[PDB]
Symmetry: C4
Subunit: 334 residues, 4 copies
């Protein structure tokens, strides 16, 4: 019995070792961006529509050539065995069963081929490596294994300053490894090398500047994720949700525009959609569910989110995600 995503955070805090909970929860620096991701969503209010036909409400979208059950995917989160022994396999199985895309990480603690074998038409998140040819090898592995999109993370020339991790002296346990292995700053040249190497849609994750969104389209990206990396990279980076509307207007249908950071309910999904998002990513809550109850926990989380999305959409007069994108919003004060 979980009735909100916050029930799951409480459950995860109970079971996880403190330093692992901190690795999960924390952000960089003073955690200004981490907090602002929540602030920004809480300031948005939706102007719902009434009296529309709701006889066949559907939360489905088409994205990167696949139907998804919700306008949502599981965000790339490294090292999922930190949270539960089944790690990425548990999460991927639940995502598959829920009809939600799952993003396999470069720093997965189970190999990408094993996770892809779970099924459910998975995405692959890329960190740019030592070498162009090595980078392109992970991309080719992902494609050969049936991944359907390459989510190239562009906001990590290096890892942010995670003061909780520094203070805890946090290190990976011996029993958690980067299973895809036996990194350098990405540039626009790296993006082109990836685009030239694969037929899969390339999705640039970590875009916040409007001109970078425009350039992403010009560069041949199939999508972007408007994101400050959950407040874990530049401390003081604007929340993605605050740039989303401007970015959606600037790209003017040229690529899919996803957003992440602080999505904690179906109502938040509705807000993101109303601001123009094609879909959202959800990170920490999926890990809370994994920590609390493994695969079944993630299943329950996704069922709860699905119900909340359906509920919010219908209450707002939206029989489809497209209708939700046409909702207006108004900023309030919290």
């Amino acid at each position: 019995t979980y009735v909100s995503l916050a029930d799951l955070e409480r459950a995860a805090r109970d079971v996880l070792p403190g330093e692992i909970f901190d690795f999960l929860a924390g952000g960089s620096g003073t955690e200004a961006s981490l907090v602002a991701n929540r602030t920004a969503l809480e300031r948005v209010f939706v102007i719902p529509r009434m009296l529309r036909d709701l006889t066949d409400v559907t939360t489905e979208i088409d994205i990167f050539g696949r139907r998804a059950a919700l306008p949502m995917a599981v965000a790339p989160v490294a090292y999922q065995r930190l949270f539960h022994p089944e790690g990425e396999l548990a999460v991927a199985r639940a995502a598959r069963d829920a009809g939600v895309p799952y993003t396999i990480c470069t720093l997965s603690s189970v190999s990408l081929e094993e996770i892809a074998a779970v099924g459910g038409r998975p995405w692959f998140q890329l960190y740019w490596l030592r070498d162009e040819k090595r980078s392109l090898d992970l991309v080719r592995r992902a494609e050969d294994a049936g991944c359907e999109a390459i989510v190239f993370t562009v906001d990590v020339p290096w890892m942010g300053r995670r003061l909780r991790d520094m203070r805890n002296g946090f290190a990976l346990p011996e029993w958690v490894t980067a299973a895809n292995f036996d990194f350098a700053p990405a540039t626009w040249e790296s993006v082109e090398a990836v685009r030239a190497h694969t037929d899969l849609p390339v999705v640039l994750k970590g875009i916040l500047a409007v001109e970078d969104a425009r350039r992403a389209v010009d560069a041949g990206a199939g999508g972007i994720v408007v994101s400050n990396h959950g407040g874990r990279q530049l401390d003081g980076a604007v929340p993605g949700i605050e740039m989303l509307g401007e970015i959606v207007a600037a790209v003017s249908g040229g690529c899919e525009v996803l957003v992440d950071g602080g999505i904690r309910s179906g109502g938040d999904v509705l807000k993101a959609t109303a601001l123009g998002a094609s879909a959202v990513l959800v990170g920490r809550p999926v890990m809370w569910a994994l920590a609390a109850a493994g695969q079944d926990g993630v299943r329950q989380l996704l069922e709860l989110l699905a119900e909340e999305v359906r509920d919010a959409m219908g209450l707002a007069g939206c029989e489809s995600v497209g209708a939700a994108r046409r909702l207006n919003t108004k900023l309030g004060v919290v």
Copy 2:
């Protein structure tokens, strides 16, 4: 001795069982909209006028063909026997004696005919039923019983997610029933079916989008209530008070424009009026009064509100509600 509406909430909390107080107080989801209803009112400041003739201050209005003693009606609140054994009869009697319209609910715990027999020229709130012909039967019953307006609630295709009720496992006590009985999403077609079935003014309750207000006028509505259902429906819905001015301008006298959500004083009534409302509805405070002291409690609440409205109007230089509608406002910070 109650000197503010907050005195009544304190009294009601003392006497009501926790789960019933929660059914009354709560909202949907995170209660963002519930809180925002209060935030929005607290941000509004009035610019009073001075030195005007106040030799005959009157708080009366004409609405739907009846004089009312205040620019206020009792909001539809389901299942009033939850709060006091006399339930709707106690509230309706006090409203009648105060010259305030009372809204009889589809989900009243005393039959609509019994409540109408109390007198006081009552309104009837409609939820759209299984069937057009059944829906229209409640409407015809209401009209035959002397109800003077049909308040069609348009923001409940289904009930919101009330997490307090879920956590409490709340259910109606055996001794409380829907006394009008021995529901489907409404659409604009439903509104037309109702309008075609009755000579009474049809008032659409739960409008927040400006274009829905315009469409309400085009559809032949006699009024609208600009409302987020007390924060009980879409969590994240904008407060009605924040949409009110824009809606008043858009309908440009084409129907009565009421507002509700968070009205807790005569000063709040003045604010609503200054933002352009024809009248307000008041929900929870009426139930606090009912719980605290039955009919006499509701009488005392309405007397207090009447005094506060008169006081606020005169201090603001308004001898009539029309003058109060011409007051200007200015947003502050709280």
Copy 3:
């Protein structure tokens, strides 16, 4: 040793009976306007000027034909014997010695003639009485006694709802009386009756609407006080400080424009001046000083305020009050 006005509030709270402290401190309703008076000042920041000649900084102004030592007068506060046995005489003596105008109240607890005999070129605050001819008698008494301005309070058609006083059951002690005696709502006609009866400047206290300020000038007022009566009248009335700039622009030198509400330091005086005020009134702090230490307390308060005003002006590059009125401001967040 008082180094801020807040030192005096602490001292007054220690010595005064609770219900008298509440009569002094309180506002109407929820005290929204009382709090907002402070909020509004705290949001204002000054843009100081540097490198200007400060060899003869003067805080003096000319107002209503008299030099004053500061851009400040003691606000009308009824019944000063509530706070100290010497009441109005103690305050008036200290104001005289400091070169600050003192406003004698219609509801003074010492007769206006006695207070005027203290000297210091006093003002007289008028509440409109039962009768035009009686009202005009107080005005004539004030003028005969040497009062130099009539401060006609225009925001009290009746007293606001003071919930602290209601809850305390507050009443005047037997030993405090309205010493000018052995009231009706004012209108613009009342203002004209007063203007026709006296050669003294008539100052309308309690103006908040821009058009009322304009009408005050048209009506022959020599000044206005932009004021919400210290949050004691309409609860939800905008702070005077928020209307001041707009009012100053609208009257365009046609009368003196004073402001009051929440002035608690020389820096606040500077802010008021920079927003365009001719001068401020100070109410509660003067009573704190009276309660704490009688005449000497008020002297110390006025010395402290004088020092703070001089300090703030010079730090802001202003050798005169006129220069301070030409300072720019910028709203911040607190």
Copy 4:
């Protein structure tokens, strides 16, 4: 092991006597400006750029004819022997070793010649003295000793009202003296006297009004520091960070534009740069480090700041400080 500047404040509070910590931490009046310096920075969010070449990130700038390792100098802070026995020598040595300019104060507790002999191409802060000829003597001493800029503080016609110091009865210990000695308000004439006396760039510290910035350029200043003196002068003065963008636009490259007040991280440096600053000054944190651990403490602070600046710049896609100045920002809510 310090991982943030806040670690150093905690360490300094532990070791310093309360009244000395208060002399350091405090501001004038109600400390409104002190707090606002932090508020203003916390409201700014950066819009980072992605995918840019970061193969040679450099935090260096050229200013007043010298390379500096960071866009930062140590602010003038009087009487550094209050914080550690080595006082200014410890701080100057660490600044030299870090490649950061150090501002020698008129009220240094070690003579300016001794501090200059440490090396590191130092600046000299001037307070205007009794006499033009005396003022010019300090300037000539500074120049003869190898100081490279004259930082003329223009916001201290006299010292602000420091209520912590008043309440503590704070006075310099016998063992701390103004070592440059065995003051009057500055004006634009004083600035010209200094400019005519030295070939060194004259930098006016404490400018907040846009027209004063313009006049500084017209007066021949080589730079300005946009500053409210750390909230220690006019209480209610706008934060420098809030005026910075407007000032940068108005001077349009005519002089260097520095800012100070509340810089507490490399991210704050990035924000200042993105708002257009040439460089920042840092005051209190340098003293925290000095108090906590002397020269080595200051070294550690500067190393930490250097790392944070590099980190923030790279995460924001900036290979140089010039690129950081071209970043856009967006205000949020905290």
